[PDB]
Swiss-Prot record, chain C:
Protein name: Large ribosomal subunit protein uL22
Highest taxon above the source species: Eukaryota
Keyword Glycoprotein: no
Interval of the full protein contained in this chain: 2 to 124 of 186
Gene Ontology annotations for the cellular component aspect, listed alphabetically: cytosolic large ribosomal subunit; cytosolic ribosome
Organism: Drosophila melanogaster (Fruit fly)
From Swiss-Prot, chain D:
PANTHER family: LARGE RIBOSOMAL SUBUNIT PROTEIN EL39, RIBOSOMAL PROTEIN L39E
Name of the featured protein: Large ribosomal subunit protein eL39
Keywords from the UniProt entry: Ribonucleoprotein, Ribosomal protein
One Gene Ontology term from the biological process aspect of the record: cytoplasmic translation
Lineage of origin: Eukaryota, Metazoa, Ecdysozoa, Arthropoda, Hexapoda
GO molecular function terms attached to this record: structural constituent of ribosome
Species of the source: Drosophila melanogaster (Fruit fly)
Pfam families: Ribosomal_L39
Keyword Membrane: no
Membrane-spanning ranges: none
GO cellular component assignments: cytosolic large ribosomal subunit
From Swiss-Prot, chain E:
Alphabetized UniProt keyword annotations: Metal-binding, Ribonucleoprotein, Ribosomal protein, RNA-binding, rRNA-binding, Zinc, Zinc-finger
SUPFAM superfamilies associated with the record: Zn-binding ribosomal proteins
Naturally occurring in which organism (per UniProt): Drosophila melanogaster
Taxonomic classification: Eukaryota, Metazoa, Ecdysozoa, Arthropoda, Hexapoda
Protein name: Large ribosomal subunit protein eL37A
Any matching Pfam family: Ribosomal_L37e
Length: 123, 92, 123, 50, 92, 131
RNA sequence: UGGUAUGCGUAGAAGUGUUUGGCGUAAGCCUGCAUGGAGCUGCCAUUGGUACAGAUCUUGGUGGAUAGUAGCAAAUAAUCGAAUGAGAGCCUUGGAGGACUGAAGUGGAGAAGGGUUUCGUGUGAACAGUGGUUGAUCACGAGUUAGUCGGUCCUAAGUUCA
RNA sequence: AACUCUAAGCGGUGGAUCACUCGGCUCAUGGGUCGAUGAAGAACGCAGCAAACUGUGCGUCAUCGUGUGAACUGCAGGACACAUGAACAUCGACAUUUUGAACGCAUAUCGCAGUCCAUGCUG
């Protein structure tokens, strides 16, 4: 049984992953069958191990979808809403760093000749 | 995404009821009685039973338990005898 | 334990209690009184007599509005009652103490009741 | 009522689950305050009412 | 005779279970909640009803998303992955 | 406590040790190394690891009952050790709760983890002696 | 509370019961004895949410009334009596037997309502202003299956609102 | 005698008093971090044994990654996967129900449509 590692999953092709989900689900059901009688190990733990095994296999296949989507939407502007850095609502709309630093042509003249220079006072 | 189909044949059938009265209905009336998802529209139940256990389903009648769960009484085609199938699922 | 007067070099004595027993607070007080300092063998016969309505228990403290019984003129007091439920529970605890007495190897004939104390339990 | 709307039936159904006397092995826990299930709603003692 | 008898003819539910708060305070006839202003944008959270806000506030519920936002702030909302400085080879 | 982050406050400190998440509970549930082991490793103390041999310096036993820790029961703030049990009226031998702050660790399990921590303890041992 | 008696202290603190002995006009104090188990006090200054009998005071507890006085009385109301149990007028129940409501029902169904109350099994304390082995109790399980009945749909009085 | 009165000893009744307290209260200090990228709150189902609190969402008392490095614990199924990891924290990757601003329209209905993609059956 030996509780599935994520590392063990990540080598496997997607076709093998989906295939292992079917096999674990049939096992989950066979263990639910045991659960009725108060199944062969007197109170039933093995049912928890396998339900969480199906969760972990689902996740590794989902993460492979997630990165597949990321690499396609990489180089491509306006990526799907869930790839967009869910930070906070305010922060997203709060003026990109380029568009805050923007200074009028005149302010560039003013600063260019006269930038505040590190001097000293006194005795 | 796209978001994977959240009612697989698995999820639809949670458990067989296995209660004392339910077992009688396997014997006599050739029905296999299942605890089902509250999302399972009867036609879900037929599909899932057919697919998981090879059985041709004649009709399905559905009750809600006062325990907030569904009972689905699945009538089997006369070609398939219940009691063999219940013990293929491993439960007496 | 703490039987609250411990009689004679505690080797001669066998004891009983019973709290919370669901019998009327002062019926038990008054029946207890009719047993106090009396030979035990006679005492059971008196309690048997009470329930058989031959004899009235004398209602000493908690006098009213207890009407009147002829049968308490043995005890010189006009007011008697037969309070059957109270007399039964005192009987049980007498038999417990006698049973305890046999275990200690105390002489059965010479058992006299030297203390009964009935106090009020939580309502 | 007598034929209860489905929303009602679900709320009442959960309430039936609550009415169970606490498993007695849970009472034996270290710093276990739980003597009993004490929110046991007995229908003619505590309704649900209003 | 409308004394206890006035209680005796009380059979018609004026309020049913709130879609917003389940507090069973929604007026059938006015289709409007006392307290929680039933589907009319505003929850009616009165500053005269200090106690009402106290019931309706953050912390009475699990605060699921917003709690995670707090820790991510300290992280300065970084998308990436920290990973592992040293070996650490998984082989049997 | 000279630095502003800093609770001397009695109520706050009691929050910390009683309500301790299991990793803080290990620190609390450390036991000092035997005088032997102090010469070998130059380590004050280590946090109890299951096969550790133990001698109880206090109560009733006050010297000896050279036995191995069954489990460190961190939520009870108690360590149970094999051979150290109290006779119950129902003949049932139940383990004596032994705090690790009563104990000498006589034998230290060696893992790569365990050695590394002894080594951290070895390196800091030089420093404040220097100071 | 600052200071102090290099104060007291689990070898028994504080607390408290106390025909211990004594002090002071008193406010009040100490001590003994018993109980106790984890901390505490005197003195000089320093601050107060600082001393209770009351306020138709508050809150909790407890008496006399009263182990029983009101009562537990409308619809006659049982009763023979077999079974069982710790105990059985009822409630457990047959058989039996007196009657009751007297089909405009104390019946047989449903809505409005109830919410597991239905039912089996176990069955004790609490509850049934009485008992109570039994129950709408308490504990443990089960049970409410619809194309055709309702909801649904439809509109009414009327409403939600762009 | 009994009872009553008065006092004392002992037992009840009752929870004052004392001493403790993972809590409360008030002042000070640092920071700014909800929401249509679907909130706060509500409902609903979830633990081997749970009914709540607490936690969580259908992957349900929790999953990646990361840190630490062997528990949890009432009883236990488990414990193994202690060397690739328990369990708790971190929690930056995902999931995150039915709702609610709440968004097809409604809501004493979990009621009823339309549309695209898709599956089985029949053909």
């Amino acid at each position: 049984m030996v509780k599935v590692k994520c590392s063990e999953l990540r080598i496997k092709d997607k076709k093998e992953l989906t295939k292992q989900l079917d096999e674990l689900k049939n096992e989950l059901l066979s263990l639910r069958v045991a659960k009725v009688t108060g199944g062969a190990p007197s109170k039933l733990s093995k049912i928890r191990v396998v339900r969480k095994a199906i969760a972990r296999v689902y996740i590794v296949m989902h993460q492979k979808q997630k990165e597949n989507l990321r690499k396609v939407f990489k180089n491509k502007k306006y990526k799907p809403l869930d790839l967009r850095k869910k930070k906070t609502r305010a922060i997203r709309k709060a003026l990109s760093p380029r568009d805050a630093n923007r200074k009028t042509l005149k302010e560039i003249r003013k600063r260019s000749v006269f930038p505040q220079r590190k001097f000293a006072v006194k005795a | 995404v796209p978001t994977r189909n959240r009612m697989d044949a698995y999820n639809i059938i949670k458990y067989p009821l296995t209660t004392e009265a339910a077992m009688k209905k396997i014997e006599d009336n050739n029905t296999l009685v299942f605890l089902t998802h509250l999302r399972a529209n009867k036609n879900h139940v037929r599909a899932a039973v057919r697919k998981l256990y090879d059985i041709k389903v004649a009709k399905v009648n559905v009750l809600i338990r006062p325990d907030g769960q569904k009972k689905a009484y699945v009538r089997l085609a006369r070609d398939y005898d219940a009691l063999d199938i219940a013990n293929k699922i491993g439960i007496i | 334990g703490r039987y609250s007067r411990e009689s004679d070099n505690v080797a001669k004595s066998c004891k009983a209690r019973g709290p919370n027993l669901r019998v009327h607070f002062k019926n038990t007080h008054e029946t207890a009184q009719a047993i106090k300092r009396m030979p035990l063998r006679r005492a059971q016969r008196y309690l048997k007599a009470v329930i058989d309505q031959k004899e009235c228990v004398p209602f000493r403290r908690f006098n009213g509005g207890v009407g009147r019984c002829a049968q308490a003129k043995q005890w010189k007091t006009t007011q008697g009652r037969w309070p059957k439920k109270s007399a039964e529970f005192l009987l049980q605890l007498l038999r417990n103490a006698e049973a305890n007495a046999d275990c200690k190897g105390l002489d059965a004939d010479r058992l006299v009741v030297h203390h009964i104390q009935v106090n009020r339990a939580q309502c | 009522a007598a034929h209860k709307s489905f929303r009602i039936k679900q709320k009442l159904a959960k309430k039936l689950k609550q009415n169970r006397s606490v498993p007695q092995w849970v009472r034996l826990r270290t710093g276990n305050t739980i003597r009993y299930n004490a929110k046991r709603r007995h229908w003619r003692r505590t309704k649900l009412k209003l | 005779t409308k004394g206890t008898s006035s209680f005796g003819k009380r059979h018609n539910k004026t309020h049913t279970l709130c879609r917003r708060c389940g507090r069973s305070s929604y007026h059938i006839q006015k289709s409007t909640c006392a307290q929680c202003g039933y589907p009319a944008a505003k929850l009616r959270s009165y500053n005269w009803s200090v106690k009402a806000k106290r019931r309706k506030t953050t912390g009475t519920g699990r605060m699921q998303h917003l709690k995670v936002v707090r820790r991510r702030f300290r992280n300065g909302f970084r998308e990436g992955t920290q990973a592992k400085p040293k070996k650490a080879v998984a082989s049997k | 406590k000279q630095n502003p982050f800093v609770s001397s406050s009695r109520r706050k400190n009691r929050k910390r040790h009683f309500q301790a998440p299991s990793h803080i509970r290990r620190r609390l549930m450390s036991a000092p190394l035997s005088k032997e082991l102090r010469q070998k490793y130059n380590v004050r103390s280590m946090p109890i690891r299951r096969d550790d041999e133990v001698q109880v310096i206090r109560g009733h036993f006050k010297g000896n009952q050279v036995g191995k820790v069954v489990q460190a029961y961190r939520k009870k703030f108690v360590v149970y050790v094999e051979k150290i049990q109290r006779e119950n009226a129902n003949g049932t031998n139940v383990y004596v709760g032994i705090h690790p702050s009563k104990v000498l660790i006589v034998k230290l399990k060696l893992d790569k983890d365990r050695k590394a921590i002894l080594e951290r303890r070895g390196k800091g041992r030089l420093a404040a002696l220097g100071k």
